């Protein structure tokens, strides 16, 4: 019933453990759950979490605003983390703001220099936004792709696949403005791998910008002279990019291009090679439900035990090709 005893069990004497839990039996919870909103520091993350269910009852009032405010640490000064902002925004089901806050957090962390933490965070937010089936803004998908190309780089380098790292590093190079922290060090070794793989023509342009006035006098002091030489004697020799049919229209675009000039839908991308999926070798990680060129996924599963993206255990044969890919290539405008 009202459970006034639970609601006021030991709520006096300035506290009773989770006094907010006590006031949170029924009704509108605004004594100690809300004194956790009156607490400018984290007395317990459990309390803010339970205030997430406080607005989970869709109370839809200024109490939700108060929680958001304590969240931003604007009146507090020491906000904890906007992961709670994501859960809170999820609660009242305004996902068009949850996606924005997700992107903001990912962008900030990415800029700072965290490059794998940003990946896991953005994957963990894509997780719920997709599981709930809400459509995912192109901003989040695009950032996921360009922030995942980075991890693919390192993997294709450690594995020793000279061309894959070049391709992905080209994509990262094009969107290197998003990457401030290692702006010379990434474009550097973008050049090195491009030349060490066969795309030295592109590396010419990239090293030019690398030797540009702003970027210059910061170039790696290992092979600064080598970079100057490559630019000085630039060869226009670049191996032509291969082609493959678009999955949901029969048309031949290159491997790293995702926007098909034909059907005009945005082809998804692998999780091993960053290319545009092919109907003939579609698959998915059993856990993260993301595409992969089955040939390439199996090829890369060279004792690396976590998935390329979700970072969970994976092995030789819990990965088999798929045929009804229309459940993945359903035209979003048609869907």
């Amino acid at each position: 019933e009202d459970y006034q005893s639970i609601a006021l069990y030991f709520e006096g004497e300035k506290r009773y453990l989770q006094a907010g839990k006590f006031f949170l039996l029924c009704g509108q919870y605004s004594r100690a759950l809300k004194h956790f909103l009156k607490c400018p520091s984290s007395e317990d993350n459990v309390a803010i979490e339970m205030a997430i269910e406080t607005v989970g009852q869709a109370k839809d009032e200024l109490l939700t605003n108060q929680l958001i405010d304590h969240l931003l640490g604007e009146n507090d000064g020491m906000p904890k983390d906007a992961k709670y902002l994501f859960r809170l925004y999820m609660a009242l089901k305004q996902y068009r703001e949850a996606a924005q806050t997700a992107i903001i957090i990912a962008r900030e962390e990415q800029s700072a220099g965290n490059y794998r933490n940003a990946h896991d965070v953005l994957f963990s937010m894509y997780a719920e936004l997709k599981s709930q089936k809400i459509k995912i803004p192109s901003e989040m998908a695009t950032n996921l792709m360009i922030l995942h190309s980075y991890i693919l780089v390192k993997i294709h380098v450690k594995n020793g696949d000279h061309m894959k790292g070049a391709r992905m590093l080209i994509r990262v190079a094009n969107n290197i403005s998003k990457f401030p922290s290692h702006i010379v060090p990434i474009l550097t070794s973008t050049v090195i791998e491009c030349h060490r793989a066969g795309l030295k023509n592109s590396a010419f342009s990239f090293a030019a910008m690398l030797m540009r006035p702003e970027y210059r006098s910061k170039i790696d002091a290992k092979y600064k002279k080598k970079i100057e030489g490559m630019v000085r004697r630039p060869d226009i020799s670049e191996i032509e990019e291969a082609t493959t049919p678009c999955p949901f229209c029969k048309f031949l675009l290159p491997e790293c291009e995702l926007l098909c000039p034909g059907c005009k839908n945005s082809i998804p991308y692998c999780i091993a090679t960053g290319r545009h999926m092919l109907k003939d070798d579609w698959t998915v990680c059993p856990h993260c439900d993301f595409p992969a060129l089955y040939s390439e996924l199996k090829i890369m599963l060279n004792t690396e035990s976590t998935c390329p993206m979700c970072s969970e255990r994976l092995n030789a044969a819990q990965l088999k090709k798929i045929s009804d890919c229309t459940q993945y290539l359903r035209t979003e405008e048609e869907l």
Binding site: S138, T142, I176, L258, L259, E332, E334
Partner: protein, 118 residues
């Protein structure tokens, strides 16, 4: 959007352009995409761009404003959102605006660009 009567008409007026556009429209396998193409067909470019943005395709709006010369529109659209190669378009657009002014003998305006672009 019959695309069957329309092609017959477009042959009844020797009009090979109309037939080819109808075929291309046939390749598209999505509604609200064919709608964007046809509101581009009659020249309502602003309507087509707004439609492209509403269906959450910044990529095609940038592309459409790139096919025409609205490089200022391309800059404004690149101001927000994020795309697959955003510096590439940014630099290309600056250089293109520099060329836009330079042909009209408007230096000190082309020079503002050509510098943000390289």
């Amino acid at each position: 959007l019959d695309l069957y009567t329309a092609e017959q008409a477009f042959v009844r007026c020797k009009d090979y352009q109309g037939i080819k556009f109808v075929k291309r429209l046939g390749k598209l396998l999505s509604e609200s995409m064919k709608q964007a193409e046809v509101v581009g067909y009659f020249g309502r470019f602003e309507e087509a761009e707004r439609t492209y943005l509403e269906m959450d395709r910044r990529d095609l709006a940038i592309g459409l404003r790139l096919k025409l010369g609205d490089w200022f529109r391309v800059l404004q659209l690149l101001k927000t959102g994020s795309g697959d190669a955003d510096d590439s378009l940014l630099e290309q657009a600056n250089n293109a605006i520099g060329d836009y002014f330079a042909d009209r003998q408007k230096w000190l305006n082309a020079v503002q660009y050509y510098v943000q672009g390289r």
